[PDB]
Amino acid sequence: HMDAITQVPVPANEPVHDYAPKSPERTRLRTELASLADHPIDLPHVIGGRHRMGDGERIDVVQPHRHAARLGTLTNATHADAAAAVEAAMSAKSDWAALPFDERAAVFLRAADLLAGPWREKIAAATMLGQSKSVYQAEIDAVCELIDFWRFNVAFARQILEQQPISGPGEWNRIDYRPLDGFVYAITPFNFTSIAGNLPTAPALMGNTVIWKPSITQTLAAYLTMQLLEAAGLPPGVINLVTGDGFAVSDVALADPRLAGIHFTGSTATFGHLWQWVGTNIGRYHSYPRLVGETGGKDFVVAHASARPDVLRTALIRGAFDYQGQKCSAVSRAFIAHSVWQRMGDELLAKAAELRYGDITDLSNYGGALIDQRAFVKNVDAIERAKGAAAVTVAVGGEYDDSEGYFVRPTVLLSDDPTYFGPLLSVHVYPDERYEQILDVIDTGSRYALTGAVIADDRQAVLTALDRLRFAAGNFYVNDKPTAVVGRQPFGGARGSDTNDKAGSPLNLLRWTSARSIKETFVAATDHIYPHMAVD
Amino acid sequence: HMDAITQVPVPANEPVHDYAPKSPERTRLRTELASLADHPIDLPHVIGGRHRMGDGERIDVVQPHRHAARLGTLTNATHADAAAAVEAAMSAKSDWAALPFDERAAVFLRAADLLAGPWREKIAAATMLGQSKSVYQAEIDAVCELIDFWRFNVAFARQILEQQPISGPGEWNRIDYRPLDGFVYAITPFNFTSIAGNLPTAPALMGNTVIWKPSITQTLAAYLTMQLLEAAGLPPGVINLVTGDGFAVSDVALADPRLAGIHFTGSTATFGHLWQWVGTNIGRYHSYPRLVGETGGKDFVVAHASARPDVLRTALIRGAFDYQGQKCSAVSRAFIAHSVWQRMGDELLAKAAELRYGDITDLSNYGGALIDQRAFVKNVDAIERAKGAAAVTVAVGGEYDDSEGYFVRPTVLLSDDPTYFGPLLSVHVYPDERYEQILDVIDTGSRYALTGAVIADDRQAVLTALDRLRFAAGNFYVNDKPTAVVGRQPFGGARGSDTNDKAGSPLNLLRWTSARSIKETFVAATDHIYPHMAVD
């Protein structure tokens, strides 16, 4: 019980550890890698706080960079598993929604500190092993970004709660940010353990309960994230983790009239299917279900003649080849001025040829393998089309081999013509004086453009890019790679999309509330007659 | 050209004039009433700044309280009219979007001052004549609320523009609030000239262009609102007014791939149809169309035994019978403690019997007539069912006559059982000690509950209501009628709805933007190798 107007702690971005050779975090990390790799586990559903395998098909979760080494085994959620998860959520709702905001918020603040200290290398290592991330890719995602989501969302939520109306003479107006009426269904992708953890927790923070269907290949880190939340004090049933491919989960969840929302990040196909199904079942729902999320895109970089060669080269390598090109937004297409290409083209090809992809438990590797067979098969396909296509030459890489892991080499293609996820970069070399025409082409070809960059020291060039490409991409970068930290690079989304409300601003959290106005009038009228009515 | 970080003027609610007998605004108002009533006009489409009648069916717009007296005549928009309106919008876009925010904002600030002074009684009178509003109902809507929308939206927009991200060391992050990519389609209802004007102008403010299809019976005030905006400097084609029933407009607009959004306020049926059509055509649109709006609901009032009788009586009269029960949210259902009913029941019935509905050019009348024949017919129907129903008694009123105007008398019904737009109030008298059970019943019967009130001096009672009915209604009032001024009673919406983004907060304006992040890095990496990669 309390008489207070409280403040939350002030958030700041969690520092990124380097895991350099003499560093203690590197030691701790090795212990965790071994411990997860040597001791594979069951990966169960977590329903109403009960950890339980179910009766559906058993599916192994392995190291993509070494697919014979198993990490755990999960069961594909059945209809009964899903139903139980929905009921556990509905059943925890009332006690969770009744906790004051500060107590709900403490759960996520505590989770963030646990992740920052004692659980840090455990969660990073699980992300490395199951998703094939280098320790760098893991630290910025499973650690820092997830910590920042939790600490910043607590702060964004608190800021929201104090957005209050004007009170005129004689009255008091107030706004109450209620949670939604039923359960929220969260569906998370493979490539980010931060997103996976944020999607179900952001709505939880606001007083909602959740079913969470993580991606199969991310399930080791998802399960450890669940345990972490439990250790932070998350009450049983507020978030309920169902494993597998999600088909039997959606069957149940999209048919329940209590579905209040879906929080999704993944492919546009999957999003479209969800969107259709909800539309088809719209008559059954107590509330209009809120569909909130994010899909992919591919990214361009334009280099002007005034671009720095070393900056461009680096931006292209990291941008195309960090996490094997599997970030929600990897550089696929680069457009480089001819004279910049003369200065850095060979070095780019040379460094890509030397770039080491392998087992990420060897920390000298730049990166790992693709996530699974499907991904491998899509990349082989794309490389063989590129070999067959007249419009395109394989300048470096193009090799692949799935016998140890799902490995595809960093590949650079030269295309003459300026018109999936994987380590493929297409480069088009354009004559210096055609800068602006290249900006038009990009603009004209920009349907699923998520991010863009310009590399240019020249201020006029930068401004022309910012201008002409204003509507060609939702996030635009200058003299760096186009690939986003909480609090710093919010919003975006692909061209034509309705995604200002995605993870990373207060707008996302509002989607998990239904605000009401409350007006008290102190001395209201006691005669209904109005002044204009008097005679005469 | 400018070097400045500017501020907008600070908004405050426009004061409501009383039009009392000696007042100069009353004189001015009479001049305007005569001038509009004596000189009926053509009511044309306004497309690309050209005022033009079209070739569709001619439809008279009359005084509902005196339907033989015509006010103007419009033409039902054809497909060609609609197409021309779309093209005029697309064609004005580029110059409007390129105006700096302050210049776009000046248009609406200027409009607001014109409305507040020289155009004031002209727009109020047009709202009185065509929509059958008393001068009070007109002043709070066509004048004050519309002025407040414009001045507060300019201020909300400015607040939005300064929501900016954190910049870490070595970088500069910024957010750009872009307009949307195609045109916005605004569709406005009969009962508020403020809403009618706000729906197309709010997105305009953010840099968008618009087609506006006002309701037939509101078209006189809509057309004068268009002229007002022209006088304030709104460039031709930024908003394009098409008259009629909207069918041929929707045919064209929902089939155009450039449709970026719909801004709607009206019935749920109409909303549902729009929503289906857009869903059906979703594959044709360049952008995902944003559907933003508001629908109706009906309102409850609960009186606790501790309620003030004079306050309750007044709240019920005004709440049920202001604007003939045709506000988006009129009181329909009241639940009154038995001992409060003993003290004020007869007076309520007596005052409702004496309440004067008539020609609103007679300023002694409380109110006017229903809006049109359909409305009249729905109310006759509802009164005849109430006569036929066992569950319900007509205690006062129930009379109707459409021979001069569409007049229905204030009607109070007593229902024994606690389970359209018009002047009908249903009253259920419950025993004092069953307060909380009545709160459950209300909660249980609350699908399309838009607002609620409690009348109670007792603080425990008030708090119990706020609690138990937390999720039963989106706007809740204490010791007043449940019927909202800009800046003071935002948000709300009906139960289960997704309408935090409705007119009256900054959230609405964000819906008419697509924010992008822009990051400049000053000294980006020139080596792609990461620290963890060093040996050993």
Tab-separated table of N, CA, C and O in Angstrom, chain A residues 203-282:
chain	number	residue	atom	x	y	z
A	203	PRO	N	3.727	-6.566	-24.018
A	203	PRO	CA	2.302	-6.470	-23.617
A	203	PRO	C	2.068	-6.894	-22.145
A	203	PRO	O	1.190	-6.357	-21.475
A	204	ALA	N	2.849	-7.878	-21.677
A	204	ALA	CA	2.786	-8.316	-20.290
A	204	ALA	C	2.964	-7.174	-19.359
A	204	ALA	O	2.199	-7.055	-18.412
A	205	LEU	N	3.967	-6.343	-19.622
A	205	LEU	CA	4.317	-5.156	-18.807
A	205	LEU	C	3.088	-4.286	-18.557
A	205	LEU	O	2.883	-3.800	-17.417
A	206	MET	N	2.243	-4.156	-19.589
A	206	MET	CA	1.082	-3.276	-19.522
A	206	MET	C	-0.071	-3.927	-18.806
A	206	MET	O	-1.120	-3.278	-18.682
A	207	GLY	N	0.075	-5.186	-18.359
A	207	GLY	CA	-0.987	-5.863	-17.580
A	207	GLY	C	-1.748	-6.988	-18.283
A	207	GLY	O	-2.785	-7.496	-17.774
A	208	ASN	N	-1.203	-7.421	-19.417
A	208	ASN	CA	-1.757	-8.488	-20.239
A	208	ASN	C	-1.113	-9.845	-20.002
A	208	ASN	O	-0.016	-9.932	-19.510
A	209	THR	N	-1.805	-10.907	-20.416
A	209	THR	CA	-1.233	-12.219	-20.389
A	209	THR	C	-1.125	-12.773	-21.821
A	209	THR	O	-1.817	-12.321	-22.724
A	210	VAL	N	-0.239	-13.749	-21.991
A	210	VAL	CA	0.346	-14.041	-23.277
A	210	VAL	C	0.600	-15.516	-23.545
A	210	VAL	O	0.950	-16.242	-22.633
A	211	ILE	N	0.434	-15.939	-24.804
A	211	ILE	CA	1.026	-17.189	-25.261
A	211	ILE	C	2.105	-16.849	-26.254
A	211	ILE	O	1.968	-15.972	-27.115
A	212	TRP	N	3.213	-17.545	-26.088
A	212	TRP	CA	4.400	-17.273	-26.834
A	212	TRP	C	4.839	-18.524	-27.582
A	212	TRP	O	5.095	-19.560	-26.980
A	213	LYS	N	4.913	-18.389	-28.900
A	213	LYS	CA	5.316	-19.464	-29.786
A	213	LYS	C	6.595	-19.051	-30.419
A	213	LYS	O	6.579	-18.325	-31.413
A	214	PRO	N	7.733	-19.463	-29.830
A	214	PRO	CA	8.994	-19.077	-30.452
A	214	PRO	C	9.344	-19.958	-31.637
A	214	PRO	O	8.730	-20.980	-31.863
A	215	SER	N	10.307	-19.509	-32.409
A	215	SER	CA	10.772	-20.231	-33.544
A	215	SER	C	11.550	-21.468	-33.072
A	215	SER	O	12.282	-21.406	-32.098
A	216	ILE	N	11.444	-22.556	-33.810
A	216	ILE	CA	12.023	-23.810	-33.372
A	216	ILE	C	13.504	-23.644	-33.129
A	216	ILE	O	13.987	-23.992	-32.048
A	217	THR	N	14.198	-23.072	-34.098
A	217	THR	CA	15.653	-22.955	-34.022
A	217	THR	C	16.176	-21.954	-32.989
A	217	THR	O	17.381	-21.890	-32.757
A	218	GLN	N	15.286	-21.179	-32.380
A	218	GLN	CA	15.664	-20.191	-31.345
A	218	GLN	C	15.214	-20.709	-29.985
A	218	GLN	O	15.392	-20.028	-28.990
A	219	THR	N	14.636	-21.914	-29.945
A	219	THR	CA	13.936	-22.356	-28.746
A	219	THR	C	14.853	-22.593	-27.548
A	219	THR	O	14.422	-22.479	-26.402
A	220	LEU	N	16.137	-22.852	-27.774
A	220	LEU	CA	17.002	-23.038	-26.606
A	220	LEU	C	17.123	-21.718	-25.847
A	220	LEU	O	16.976	-21.700	-24.637
A	221	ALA	N	17.439	-20.641	-26.556
A	221	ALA	CA	17.509	-19.344	-25.920
A	221	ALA	C	16.108	-18.918	-25.425
A	221	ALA	O	15.972	-18.328	-24.351
A	222	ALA	N	15.060	-19.259	-26.155
A	222	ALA	CA	13.743	-18.848	-25.666
A	222	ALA	C	13.433	-19.499	-24.317
A	222	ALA	O	12.874	-18.856	-23.433
A	223	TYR	N	13.801	-20.769	-24.179
A	223	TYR	CA	13.487	-21.525	-22.972
A	223	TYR	C	14.310	-20.992	-21.861
A	223	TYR	O	13.842	-20.866	-20.755
A	224	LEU	N	15.535	-20.587	-22.133
A	224	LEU	CA	16.348	-20.057	-21.021
A	224	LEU	C	15.852	-18.634	-20.614
A	224	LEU	O	15.925	-18.272	-19.448
A	225	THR	N	15.295	-17.888	-21.582
A	225	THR	CA	14.704	-16.591	-21.361
A	225	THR	C	13.465	-16.734	-20.451
A	225	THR	O	13.288	-15.986	-19.492
A	226	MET	N	12.642	-17.726	-20.732
A	226	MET	CA	11.584	-18.089	-19.820
A	226	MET	C	12.052	-18.396	-18.409
A	226	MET	O	11.496	-17.912	-17.434
A	227	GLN	N	13.096	-19.191	-18.262
A	227	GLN	CA	13.599	-19.452	-16.926
A	227	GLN	C	14.085	-18.183	-16.243
A	227	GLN	O	13.922	-18.004	-15.041
A	228	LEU	N	14.723	-17.316	-17.020
A	228	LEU	CA	15.255	-16.082	-16.504
A	228	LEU	C	14.115	-15.248	-15.945
A	228	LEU	O	14.218	-14.703	-14.838
A	229	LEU	N	13.029	-15.160	-16.701
A	229	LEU	CA	11.874	-14.392	-16.268
A	229	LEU	C	11.237	-14.944	-15.015
A	229	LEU	O	10.724	-14.177	-14.190
A	230	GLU	N	11.184	-16.268	-14.931
A	230	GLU	CA	10.764	-16.935	-13.721
A	230	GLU	C	11.614	-16.556	-12.505
A	230	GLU	O	11.103	-16.202	-11.457
A	231	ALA	N	12.919	-16.632	-12.668
A	231	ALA	CA	13.856	-16.203	-11.632
A	231	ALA	C	13.665	-14.702	-11.244
A	231	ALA	O	13.859	-14.308	-10.082
A	232	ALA	N	13.211	-13.877	-12.192
A	232	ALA	CA	12.980	-12.432	-11.915
A	232	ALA	C	11.680	-12.223	-11.227
A	232	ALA	O	11.388	-11.112	-10.819
A	233	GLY	N	10.889	-13.275	-11.069
A	233	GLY	CA	9.564	-13.147	-10.426
A	233	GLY	C	8.290	-13.094	-11.268
A	233	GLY	O	7.175	-12.814	-10.738
A	234	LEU	N	8.407	-13.366	-12.558
A	234	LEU	CA	7.219	-13.413	-13.388
A	234	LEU	C	6.243	-14.501	-12.890
A	234	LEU	O	6.602	-15.674	-12.800
A	235	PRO	N	5.020	-14.103	-12.537
A	235	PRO	CA	4.070	-15.062	-12.026
A	235	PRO	C	3.634	-16.108	-13.069
A	235	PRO	O	3.620	-15.822	-14.255
A	236	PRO	N	3.294	-17.319	-12.611
A	236	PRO	CA	2.961	-18.418	-13.510
A	236	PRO	C	1.751	-18.124	-14.344
A	236	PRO	O	0.765	-17.574	-13.855
A	237	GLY	N	1.839	-18.429	-15.636
A	237	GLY	CA	0.702	-18.179	-16.554
A	237	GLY	C	0.598	-16.836	-17.176
A	237	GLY	O	-0.201	-16.644	-18.071
A	238	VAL	N	1.418	-15.888	-16.770
A	238	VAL	CA	1.325	-14.563	-17.404
A	238	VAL	C	1.865	-14.637	-18.851
A	238	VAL	O	1.300	-14.038	-19.766
A	239	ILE	N	2.967	-15.350	-19.026
A	239	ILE	CA	3.470	-15.763	-20.339
A	239	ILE	C	3.623	-17.267	-20.355
A	239	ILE	O	4.197	-17.849	-19.425
A	240	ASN	N	3.156	-17.876	-21.447
A	240	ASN	CA	3.038	-19.299	-21.584
A	240	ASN	C	3.681	-19.668	-22.897
A	240	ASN	O	3.219	-19.239	-23.946
A	241	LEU	N	4.715	-20.488	-22.836
A	241	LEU	CA	5.579	-20.813	-23.966
A	241	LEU	C	5.140	-22.127	-24.550
A	241	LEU	O	5.177	-23.152	-23.865
A	242	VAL	N	4.719	-22.083	-25.809
A	242	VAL	CA	4.415	-23.281	-26.591
A	242	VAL	C	5.399	-23.469	-27.749
A	242	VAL	O	5.529	-22.602	-28.615
A	243	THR	N	6.088	-24.608	-27.759
A	243	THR	CA	7.038	-24.923	-28.816
A	243	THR	C	6.472	-25.551	-30.081
A	243	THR	O	5.327	-26.041	-30.134
A	244	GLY	N	7.302	-25.522	-31.115
A	244	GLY	CA	6.974	-26.146	-32.396
A	244	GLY	C	6.822	-25.211	-33.570
A	244	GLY	O	7.378	-24.114	-33.565
A	245	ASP	N	6.072	-25.661	-34.572
A	245	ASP	CA	5.886	-24.912	-35.812
A	245	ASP	C	4.692	-23.922	-35.738
A	245	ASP	O	4.504	-23.095	-36.634
A	246	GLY	N	3.865	-24.026	-34.704
A	246	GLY	CA	2.842	-23.041	-34.468
A	246	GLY	C	1.503	-23.319	-35.111
A	246	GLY	O	0.515	-22.624	-34.785
A	247	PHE	N	1.429	-24.330	-35.983
A	247	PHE	CA	0.172	-24.553	-36.744
A	247	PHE	C	-0.998	-24.918	-35.859
A	247	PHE	O	-2.091	-24.372	-35.992
A	248	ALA	N	-0.765	-25.793	-34.911
A	248	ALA	CA	-1.844	-26.228	-34.013
A	248	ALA	C	-2.130	-25.140	-32.986
A	248	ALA	O	-3.227	-25.067	-32.438
A	249	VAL	N	-1.136	-24.297	-32.728
A	249	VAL	CA	-1.344	-23.162	-31.819
A	249	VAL	C	-2.247	-22.135	-32.451
A	249	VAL	O	-3.183	-21.632	-31.814
A	250	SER	N	-1.969	-21.802	-33.708
A	250	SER	CA	-2.783	-20.804	-34.407
A	250	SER	C	-4.187	-21.353	-34.551
A	250	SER	O	-5.161	-20.652	-34.353
A	251	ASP	N	-4.311	-22.637	-34.871
A	251	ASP	CA	-5.650	-23.236	-34.982
A	251	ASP	C	-6.479	-22.906	-33.790
A	251	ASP	O	-7.631	-22.575	-33.934
A	252	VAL	N	-5.900	-23.048	-32.604
A	252	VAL	CA	-6.637	-22.835	-31.376
A	252	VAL	C	-6.803	-21.351	-31.074
A	252	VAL	O	-7.924	-20.862	-30.816
A	253	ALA	N	-5.698	-20.622	-31.154
A	253	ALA	CA	-5.700	-19.239	-30.737
A	253	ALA	C	-6.539	-18.313	-31.621
A	253	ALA	O	-7.262	-17.449	-31.106
A	254	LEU	N	-6.499	-18.510	-32.929
A	254	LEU	CA	-7.256	-17.637	-33.822
A	254	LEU	C	-8.751	-17.972	-33.877
A	254	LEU	O	-9.557	-17.189	-34.375
A	255	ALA	N	-9.098	-19.139	-33.355
A	255	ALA	CA	-10.450	-19.517	-33.168
A	255	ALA	C	-10.996	-19.110	-31.811
A	255	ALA	O	-12.189	-19.211	-31.595
A	256	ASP	N	-10.153	-18.714	-30.859
A	256	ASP	CA	-10.699	-18.301	-29.552
A	256	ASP	C	-11.283	-16.879	-29.586
A	256	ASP	O	-10.606	-15.925	-29.967
A	257	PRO	N	-12.517	-16.709	-29.121
A	257	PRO	CA	-13.104	-15.340	-29.115
A	257	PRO	C	-12.410	-14.359	-28.163
A	257	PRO	O	-12.688	-13.148	-28.212
A	258	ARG	N	-11.551	-14.886	-27.288
A	258	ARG	CA	-10.784	-14.054	-26.353
A	258	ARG	C	-9.460	-13.507	-26.876
A	258	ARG	O	-8.807	-12.757	-26.159
A	259	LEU	N	-9.081	-13.860	-28.101
A	259	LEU	CA	-7.894	-13.306	-28.747
A	259	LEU	C	-7.969	-11.812	-28.861
A	259	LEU	O	-8.843	-11.299	-29.511
A	260	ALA	N	-7.040	-11.108	-28.230
A	260	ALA	CA	-7.067	-9.638	-28.143
A	260	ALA	C	-6.049	-9.016	-29.040
A	260	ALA	O	-6.152	-7.865	-29.397
A	261	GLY	N	-5.048	-9.781	-29.410
A	261	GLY	CA	-3.976	-9.239	-30.183
A	261	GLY	C	-2.968	-10.301	-30.563
A	261	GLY	O	-2.929	-11.376	-29.958
A	262	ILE	N	-2.187	-9.965	-31.598
A	262	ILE	CA	-1.113	-10.774	-32.067
A	262	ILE	C	0.114	-9.873	-32.213
A	262	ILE	O	0.031	-8.793	-32.799
A	263	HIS	N	1.246	-10.325	-31.673
A	263	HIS	CA	2.467	-9.558	-31.732
A	263	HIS	C	3.462	-10.403	-32.487
A	263	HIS	O	3.885	-11.446	-31.990
A	264	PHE	N	3.783	-9.975	-33.704
A	264	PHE	CA	4.404	-10.865	-34.671
A	264	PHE	C	5.626	-10.222	-35.261
A	264	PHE	O	5.650	-9.025	-35.510
A	265	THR	N	6.649	-11.017	-35.473
A	265	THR	CA	7.746	-10.604	-36.313
A	265	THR	C	8.253	-11.805	-37.081
A	265	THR	O	8.516	-12.844	-36.468
A	266	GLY	N	8.332	-11.642	-38.403
A	266	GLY	CA	8.699	-12.695	-39.339
A	266	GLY	C	8.525	-12.327	-40.815
A	266	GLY	O	8.641	-11.175	-41.191
A	267	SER	N	8.252	-13.321	-41.646
A	267	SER	CA	8.033	-13.096	-43.090
A	267	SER	C	6.695	-12.429	-43.344
A	267	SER	O	5.770	-12.651	-42.599
A	268	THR	N	6.587	-11.659	-44.428
A	268	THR	CA	5.300	-11.132	-44.898
A	268	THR	C	4.267	-12.246	-45.277
A	268	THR	O	3.074	-12.091	-45.087
A	269	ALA	N	4.707	-13.374	-45.803
A	269	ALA	CA	3.759	-14.446	-46.107
A	269	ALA	C	3.012	-14.864	-44.835
A	269	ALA	O	1.766	-14.894	-44.796
A	270	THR	N	3.786	-15.188	-43.795
A	270	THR	CA	3.218	-15.585	-42.549
A	270	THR	C	2.335	-14.493	-42.016
A	270	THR	O	1.319	-14.793	-41.456
A	271	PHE	N	2.708	-13.230	-42.180
A	271	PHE	CA	1.907	-12.164	-41.632
A	271	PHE	C	0.582	-12.077	-42.340
A	271	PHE	O	-0.480	-11.911	-41.701
A	272	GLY	N	0.656	-12.181	-43.667
A	272	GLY	CA	-0.520	-12.151	-44.528
A	272	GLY	C	-1.516	-13.241	-44.212
A	272	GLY	O	-2.696	-12.958	-44.133
A	273	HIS	N	-1.044	-14.476	-44.047
A	273	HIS	CA	-1.890	-15.601	-43.628
A	273	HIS	C	-2.613	-15.333	-42.288
A	273	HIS	O	-3.841	-15.584	-42.164
A	274	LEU	N	-1.861	-14.852	-41.286
A	274	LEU	CA	-2.452	-14.455	-39.984
A	274	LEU	C	-3.508	-13.404	-40.187
A	274	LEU	O	-4.606	-13.479	-39.619
A	275	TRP	N	-3.170	-12.428	-41.009
A	275	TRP	CA	-4.067	-11.319	-41.226
A	275	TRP	C	-5.388	-11.830	-41.875
A	275	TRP	O	-6.492	-11.466	-41.442
A	276	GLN	N	-5.279	-12.745	-42.841
A	276	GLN	CA	-6.477	-13.330	-43.491
A	276	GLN	C	-7.366	-14.137	-42.571
A	276	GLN	O	-8.600	-14.011	-42.584
A	277	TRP	N	-6.726	-14.970	-41.769
A	277	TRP	CA	-7.419	-15.827	-40.826
A	277	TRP	C	-8.196	-15.001	-39.794
A	277	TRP	O	-9.368	-15.258	-39.517
A	278	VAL	N	-7.539	-14.007	-39.229
A	278	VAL	CA	-8.224	-13.130	-38.291
A	278	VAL	C	-9.395	-12.456	-39.004
A	278	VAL	O	-10.497	-12.354	-38.435
A	279	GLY	N	-9.179	-11.988	-40.231
A	279	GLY	CA	-10.285	-11.358	-40.983
A	279	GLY	C	-11.495	-12.268	-41.204
A	279	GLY	O	-12.649	-11.844	-41.053
A	280	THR	N	-11.204	-13.518	-41.564
A	280	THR	CA	-12.189	-14.552	-41.731
A	280	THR	C	-12.933	-14.783	-40.433
A	280	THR	O	-14.161	-14.900	-40.460
A	281	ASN	N	-12.230	-14.859	-39.301
A	281	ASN	CA	-12.920	-15.133	-38.016
A	281	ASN	C	-13.402	-13.917	-37.245
A	281	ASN	O	-13.766	-14.060	-36.067
A	282	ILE	N	-13.423	-12.732	-37.890
A	282	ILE	CA	-13.599	-11.424	-37.173
A	282	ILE	C	-14.888	-11.376	-36.367
A	282	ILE	O	-14.936	-10.771	-35.317
